[PDB]
Amino acid sequence: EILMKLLQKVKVWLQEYWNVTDLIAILLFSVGMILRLQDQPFRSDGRVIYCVNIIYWYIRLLDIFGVNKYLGPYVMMIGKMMIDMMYFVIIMLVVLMSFGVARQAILFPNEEPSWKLAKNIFYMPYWMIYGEVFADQIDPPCGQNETREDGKTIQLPPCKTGAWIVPAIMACYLLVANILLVNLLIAVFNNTFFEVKSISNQVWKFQRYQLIMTFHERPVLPPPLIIFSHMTMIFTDDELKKVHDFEEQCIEEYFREKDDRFNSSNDERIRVTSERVENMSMRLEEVNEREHSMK
Amino acid sequence: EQLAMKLLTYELKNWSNATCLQLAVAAKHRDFIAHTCSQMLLTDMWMGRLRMGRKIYEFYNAPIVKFWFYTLAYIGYLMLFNYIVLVKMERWPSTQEWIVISYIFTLGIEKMREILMKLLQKVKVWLQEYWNVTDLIAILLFSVGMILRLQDQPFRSDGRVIYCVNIIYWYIRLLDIFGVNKYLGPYVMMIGKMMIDMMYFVIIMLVVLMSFGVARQAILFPNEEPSWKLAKNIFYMPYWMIYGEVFADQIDPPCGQNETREDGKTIQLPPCKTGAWIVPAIMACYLLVANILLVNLLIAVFNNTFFEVKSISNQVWKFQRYQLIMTFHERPVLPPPLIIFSHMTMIFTDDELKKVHDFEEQCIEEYFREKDDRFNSSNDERIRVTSERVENMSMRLEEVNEREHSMK
Ligand SMILES: CCCCCCCC/C=C\CCCCCCCC(=O)O[C@H](COC(=O)CCCCCCCCCCCCCCC)COP(=O)(O)OCCN
Ligand SMILES: CCCCCCCC/C=C\CCCCCCCC(=O)O[C@H](COC(=O)CCCCCCCCCCCCCCC)COP(=O)(O)OCCN
Ligand SMILES: CC(C)CCC[C@@H](C)[C@H]1CC[C@H]2[C@@H]3CC=C4C[C@@H](OC(=O)CCC(=O)O)CC[C@]4(C)[C@H]3CC[C@]12C
Ligand SMILES: CC(C)CCC[C@@H](C)[C@H]1CC[C@H]2[C@@H]3CC=C4C[C@@H](OC(=O)CCC(=O)O)CC[C@]4(C)[C@H]3CC[C@]12C
Ligand SMILES: CC(C)CCC[C@@H](C)[C@H]1CC[C@H]2[C@@H]3CC=C4C[C@@H](OC(=O)CCC(=O)O)CC[C@]4(C)[C@H]3CC[C@]12C
Ligand SMILES: CC(C)CCC[C@@H](C)[C@H]1CC[C@H]2[C@@H]3CC=C4C[C@@H](OC(=O)CCC(=O)O)CC[C@]4(C)[C@H]3CC[C@]12C
User: Fold this and answer.
1) CB B355 within 8 A of CB B223
2) DSSP-derived secondary structure for A76-145
3) Which residues participate in 1,2-dioctanoyl-sn-glycero-3-phospho-(1D-myo-inositol-4,5-bisphosphate) binding (chain A)?
4) B183 is annotated as contributing to ligand binding
5) Looking at residue B248, what DSSP letter applies?
6) Contact B270, B241 (CB under 8 A)
7) How many CA atoms lie within 13 A of B384 on its CB side?
8) Under a CB-based contact definition with an 8 Å cutoff, are residues B401 and A293 in contact?
9) CB-CB: which of B165, B244, B303 is closest to A187?
10) Distance A128 CA to ligand 3 centre (A)
11) Residue A200 CA to chain centroid, in angstroms?
12) What sign has the CA pseudo-torsion B117, B119, B120, B121?
């Protein structure tokens, strides 16, 4: 398809993003296939590459759905709302990191450097958004004299210098996140929906032509079997006068109608009436004054 | 465009050499600044000479690069603060903590220099902004924490917690940095305006929460001596009930019954309480009232207020842009960590004017003539004139016709 200067063809091809993503996915699949066949230690990596790659092909069904009348605009609307999603994400991330760092620092006062800290910063607070608050770990009893049940008494730890601040910050963070920002995003979507809808519909109606022509030019067979297709590929005046007369008549009628509509405007009538009245009044006054001599 | 740009800014000996933009900003017109030409001039000043020997001076004094340097320094300081708080601390501070405290105190010194430039008027104007007040409070808290940290074991753990709680304000202060962005500044103002509706919702939510908590606590634990745990228990579970944790285990335990148990000796069940089913009933009613009604009402409030707030926020940001640009124009080149050396250094044609005036006079004349022509072209003016002349003409014609009888 790209083969049909070459730089212009490449630029036009890159104008579309689906082709770029398809090329990237095909390259990743080739890498995975090469890794799969080379002995035991590499085969498990190629399998995971396949598993992660299948997701793009699963999602590519939106391009197929684009043809549908009632379903194409949905995809464009989602694509446009992704930007507001990102803007929400930035602030959500800032608040998330603040809360996570505070929680991690308040607890575990002594701990040597390691990479687990970064994971712990993000782990719990992100899941706190979607309804999992970890009720067990909010505020454990810590130090006390507990005899336990059905077992020997277990001496409780000595607690930490400050922990109640952790529940306080948790409450504040949940209040800020689960209520304010999400509802603000809902309002943004509600405001932008009407503006985006008509534009998306018109743009889809325009892209319909290119879709139809692309499917008109393609070979009959599908990709699995078009290898044979590739092998084959490498191997009246009166009517025109009537149309012109019709067009000329239409032009004349349209111009005449436009002129008549402009003349029918009340502004034109008012202007003409005022001009004639002013001229007529002056002429009448002169006649009346001149009539005195006749008298 | 060039004539407008020239007319906008040029020193006037008549008005103490003050340009039009300065007067408009001081007047707080809020619409002269937002005009496209003014925004273009502000952007041109923002990018300085590089509107893409002398390079070292011009490039490094442009506001934009100084802004980026300040941002990078702030980000690095934040990273060091995070590393410090996460990792354990010995009796004496490390290099990172020295760098952090030096940054904090240099920032305080910079604030003092800025306020120093009567003194009461300066203080009032400074307090007009809230970010400076919050920064001062945070710096004082950090100083308290630093003093507490160094005084023996029992106090050091308190200073560490002070640091941990303080870092949050610096984390949140990135909104001021984001304020410069075109598409992101208005978001912050919108959030600030919605906080009020948040508070109004909070009051009623708190009332209902307290009612339910007190009812639950009183129905259970009929006998219990006074203590502070009751206040905590009033608030604990019901607040978390909002966000999807209902504590299914504790809704309605079996209480009294003959249970043989499993894989163990039979455990005699307690004798229950006088009334418990009322607790599930009240829980259901409270959840219905809270998780559905009030939240959706708040959603509706936000939807209604969003459009009203959006345009005002955009205009206000466009106005504040000028002060932002000038503030970054006046600041020193170096960022806070290294401006101690900066502080040490600091302590140590007529024809064109006639053409502009002629252009302005021509514009005034043209505008007034156009306004007069537009007013005269109004249909009301034509209708009024036509009626007046017709009435006068009709009366004159009637008199002539009556007088014509004598001639006959
Ligand atoms: C290491 C971990 C990686 C994480 C992998 C992702 C996790 C899988 C689960 C969920 C992923 C869902 C991602 C949401 C995708 C939304 C895309 C969408 O609807 O917007 C579309 C945007 O269209 C585009 O521009 C094409 C962009 C598609 C890229 C999607 C890639 C996501 C899949 C990741 C898998 C990894 C391979 C990716 C290779 C690039 C629809 O708009 P349009 O009108 O058709 O514009 C076409 C312009 N000519
Ligand atoms: C003892 C326990 C204390 C609890 C600590 C808080 C818990 C930490 C987790 C989450 C905190 C999130 C708080 C939400 C902050 C929202 C602020 C916001 O976006 O509104 C802003 C309002 O702007 C302002 O007026 C500045 C006010 C900022 C104060 C924020 C302080 C909260 C942090 C608390 C930390 C303790 C130190 C505080 C010291 C005062 C944006 O509006 P603006 O247009 O820029 O107005 C500027 C006027 N010139
Ligand atoms: C505000 C938006 C942008 C959300 C961003 C949050 C993500 C960056 C967080 C949420 C959950 C996190 C993950 C939680 C757990 C892990 C496993 C971790 O790998 C291991 O734990 C090694 C094996 C082991 O030791 O158990 C690598 C990071 C990852 C994917 C974390 C990386 C960052 C994630 C994806
Ligand atoms: C946007 C800003 C706030 C940056 C993000 C804040 C933190 C999540 C980042 C910033 C720098 C990071 C640190 C960079 C260097 C190190 C040391 C390094 O630990 C080791 O050297 C030991 C390696 C091992 O034994 O595995 C890895 C974690 C840590 C603390 C990183 C963990 C997370 C930190 C504190
Ligand atoms: C409607 C809006 C305004 C929500 C307001 C609710 C908050 C005032 C509640 C929710 C969770 C409560 C916290 C839950 C647990 C604790 C720990 C408690 O400290 C202890 O328990 C001492 C140590 C111990 O005995 O275990 C101090 C109060 C605090 C922060 C509670 C105080 C009040 C909080 C923040
Ligand atoms: C807005 C209105 C409804 C006020 C809030 C209602 C309750 C949450 C407050 C009001 C008065 C408070 C009481 C004021 C005095 C005391 C006694 C005091 O207990 C002790 O004297 C023993 C101290 C100890 O042993 O620790 C602390 C709790 C209690 C019941 C307080 C707990 C919570 C109460 C009932």
Assistant:
1) no
2) HHHHHHHHHHHHHHHHHHHHHHHHHHHHHHHS--S----THHHHHHHHHHHHHTTT---GGGSS---SS-
3) 69-70
4) yes
5) G
6) no
7) 7
8) no
9) B303
10) 14
11) 11
12) negative
Nearest CA in chain A to B404: A295
DSSP states of B104-131 as a string?
HHHHHHHHHHHHH--HHHHHHHHHHSHH
Report resolution in angstroms: 3.1
Q: Is the CB of B18 under 6 A from ligand 2?
A: no
Q: Residue A210 CA to chain centroid, in angstroms?
A: 22
Q: Side-chain half-sphere of B240: how many Cα atoms within 13 Å?
A: 20
C-alpha A134/C-alpha A166 separation (Å) is 13
Identify the sign of the CA torsion A181, A183, A185, A188: negative
Cα A259 to Cα A272: distance, rounded to the nearest angstrom? 16
* CB-CB neighbours of B406 under 10 Å: 7
Cα–Cα distance for residue pair B81/B318, rounded to 1 Å: 34
B244: left (phi over 0), alpha (psi -120 to 50) or beta: left
Q: Which residues are CB-neighbours of A213 under 8 A, at least 6 positions away?
A: none
d(CA A263, CA A260): 5
Q: Which two tokens stand for residue B180?
A: 């410069």
| Sequence-distant (≥ 6) Cβ neighbours of residue B379 within 8 angstroms | A266, A267, A270
The answer to whether the Cβ–Cβ distance between A271 and B307 falls below 8 Å is no
User: How far is residue A164's CA from residue A108's CA, in Å, rounded to a whole number?
Assistant: 15
- Which method was used? cryo-EM
Task: Calculate the alpha carbon distances from B83 to A104, A105, B87, B103, B295 in Å.
Answer: 12, 10, 6, 16, 39
Structure tokens at A95: 């608040």
Closest CA to B238 of B191, B284, B272: B284
Number of CB atoms found within 10 A of residue B194's CB:
21
